Amino acid sequence: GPSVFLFPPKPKDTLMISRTPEVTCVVVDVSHEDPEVKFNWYVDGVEVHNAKTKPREEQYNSTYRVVSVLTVLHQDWLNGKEYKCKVSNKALPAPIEKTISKAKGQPREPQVYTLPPSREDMTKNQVRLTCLVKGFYPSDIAVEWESNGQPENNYKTTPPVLDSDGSFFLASKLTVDKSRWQQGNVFSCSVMHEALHNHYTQKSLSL
């Protein structure tokens, strides 16, 4: 049987208006016998036809893979608008329906703390700058790292962990060359969450 995947849009996309948030509907393991896939898109019940559908790509048990992407609107998704994808195939007993929407519950602003390089780290060849985030709802968040108005891509961020009370937390960790840190450069911790004024806050870090 063919499985369906309905991905929510990148939290950075839903929070940056210069970007376009999109819900993706992936269909995997689609057979040679019945390879046609018909996508239906719904918003709270109301069907929409604006969606774009890419051609097929090959798979392994000599099968196919189909993808349909639907532009959603920033203000729309953030309200908690329910998005539905109806996938139909001749090899399907019935039409398959997946549903994804921004999580309900009282939204909360994240707190951001910065942890400068450790005493050990400072002896090593590269240092790790750390950014700790806690008390946020929903888990939709986008932590990124920048230095001198340019991106720093050499970082890793844990998935949002559920807090005991009901909020979320995570840790992001940028690894930089020590000489760059020692040279006095400032490194910023960009956090984009729904419950942030202008969806943006920034704590930075310098020697």
Partner: peptide
């Protein structure tokens, strides 16, 4: 007021 991110606009209140 508008917050930006590395050149691209984030959000305006």
């Amino acid at each position: 007021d508008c917050a930006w991110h590395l050149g691209e606009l984030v959000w305006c209140t």
